[PDB]
Design a protein around this ligand. Structure first.
Ligand SMILES: NCc1ccc(C[C@H](NC(=O)c2ccccc2)C(=O)N2CCCCC2)cc1
Lengths: 156, 39
């Protein structure tokens, strides 16, 4: 079906009407999204079928039609843009300076923006427009606000 | 059941809405991929 590069909505008809469960990135013929969005299930693109190719619950990532292609990284200094694709609303770029998630295994960038849960999978971009990660797996802080990790996979 | 629909191109947009803070949080990542606050 549709294999053009870009940001896509991930929809279902199992619930009431058509519901947006998440978002993904098509790049180099590979569809990239977060594991919690699809739970590794197959996807439909018009009349075509996309089968899962790689996935990992711990990283909360899954790729379709091929291996993970997104290899850009946050430089740890510069501002970035969340290309938010919220449910029933137009794609919108939001500029922000990432914070940090300090873990025993190393530090990861974090974006402090609040969108509905169906926004999971929206890409995070650097100044050249390269995807440095996906938005949607993170934590809730004391004021009920949501902070997401900048979740990036590994390219072979 | 699940299906994809195109939503846009992946580009950086000059003069976009600038919002959001930069918090430093101590976190733990479990086997199920869940992040949690360590304070
Ligand atoms: N294994 C269970 C499980 C854990 C984590 C997720 C992802 C979830 N994403 C959002 O809620 C979200 C909100 C706004 C925008 C984008 C995504 C999340 O990070 N939390 C859910 C529970 C609260 C804090 C962790 C799903 C399933």
């Amino acid at each position: 079906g549709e294999t053009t590069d870009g940001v896509y909505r991930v929809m279902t008809r199992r619930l009431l009407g058509s519901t947006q469960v998440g978002v993904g990135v098509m790049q180099e013929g590979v569809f990239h999204t977060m594991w919690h969005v699809t739970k590794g299930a197959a996807l439909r693109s018009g009349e075509g079928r996309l089968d899962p190719y790689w996935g990992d619950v711990k990283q909360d990532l899954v790729s379709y039609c091929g291996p993970w292609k997104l290899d850009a990284a946050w430089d740890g200094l510069s501002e970035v843009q969340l290309l938010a694709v919220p449910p029933g609303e137009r794609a919108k770029n939001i500029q922000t300076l990432p914070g940090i998630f300090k873990t025993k295994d190393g530090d990861i960038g974090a974006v402090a923006l609040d969108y509905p849960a169906g926004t999971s999978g929206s890409p995070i971009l650097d100044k050249c427009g390269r995807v440095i990660g996906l938005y949607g797996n993170g934590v809730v802080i004391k004021n009920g606000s949501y902070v997401s990790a900048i979740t990036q996979g590994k390219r072979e | 059941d699940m299906y994809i629909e195109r939503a846009g191109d992946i580009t950086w947009e000059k003069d976009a809405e600038v919002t959001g803070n930069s918090p430093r949080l101590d976190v733990a990542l479990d086997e199920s991929g869940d992040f949690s606050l360590v304070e």
